[PDB]
Amino acid sequence: GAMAPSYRVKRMDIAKNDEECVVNAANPRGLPGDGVCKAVYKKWPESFKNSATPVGTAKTVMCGTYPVIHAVGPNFSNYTESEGDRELAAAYREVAKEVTRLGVNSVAIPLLSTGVYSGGKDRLTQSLNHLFTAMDSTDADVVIYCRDKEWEKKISEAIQMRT
Ligand SMILES: [Cl-]
Ligand SMILES: [Cl-]
Ligand SMILES: [Cl-]
Numbered sequence: 189g190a191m192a193p194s195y196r197v198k199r200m201d202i203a204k205n206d207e208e209c210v211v212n213a214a215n216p217r218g219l220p221g222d223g224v225c226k227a228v229y230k231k232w233p234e235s236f237k238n239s240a241t242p243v244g245t246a247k248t249v250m251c252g253t254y255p256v257i258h259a260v261g262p263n264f265s266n267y268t269e270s271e272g273d274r275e276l277a278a279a280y281r282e283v284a285k286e287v288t289r290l291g292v293n294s295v296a297i298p299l300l301s302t303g304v305y306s307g308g309k310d311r312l313t314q315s316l317n318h319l320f321t322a323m324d325s326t327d328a329d330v331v332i333y334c335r336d337k338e339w340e341k342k343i344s345e346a347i348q349m350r351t
Contacts, residue, residue: 189327190293195320195347199340202333203231205296211283213298213305214258216243224298224333232256243267244278248286257286261300261315264307276301276315280322287328294329299343312339316346 202210202224210232213224218239220229229236234249235256241247246259259282262275279300287295299315316332323330334340 190329193327193329195323195330195332197332197334197340197343197347199334199337201227202296202298203227205331205333207294207296207329207331208292209255209257209287209290209295211246211257211259211295211297212239213300213303214239214241214247214260216240216260218258223303228256244275244282246279246282246286248290255286255290255292257283257290257295259283259300261305263305264301264309264311265305272301272307273314276311277318277321280318284322284326287323287326292328294331296331296333297323298333299339312342313346316343320350 212228215221218236220226232251235251237249239247239249239258241258241260243260243262246257248255248257259279261279262272264272302311302315332343334343
């Protein structure tokens with residue numbers, strides 16, 4: 189465990205993380221994809237061997253000894269708001285189980301279903317609150333990665349609110 193388990197946010201490429209493992213915002217088929225998934229494919233392509241897994245699940249594949257946790261959020265273009273919310277919550281619960289099983293002291297994590305799976309909606313709060321629900325009972329240092337300056341400020345404020 190971390191000595192004083194924390195949440196932090198950084199506005200940078202998750203492929204350049206400084207944590208002991210990474211969560212990929214994966215597609216169900218283990219394809220290179222776009223956005224976070226394509227950056228992860230370029231950095232850790234060996235981790236895409238048999239990485240296909242259903243929506244609402246996470247599957248870890250090693251790149252050398254570096255764990256890549258493939259977490260499959262729902263595409264809100266295809267799911268109802270209700271079913272999509274349930275699968276997004278479930279994907280983060282499966283990430284918490286994998287982080288625990290691996291025994292890592294830190295994890296790099298993107299906000300699932302906030303990009304091309306967002307169905308065109310701002311899901312910062314929705315996705316972050318499900319991340320907290322899952323990861324609060326873990327003792328890994330969690331470092332959340334984003335690309336937008338306004339998102340960085342809002343994620344930082346949400347972390348500070350609970351402090
Ligand atoms: Cl960067
Ligand atoms: Cl996404
Ligand atoms: Cl972002």
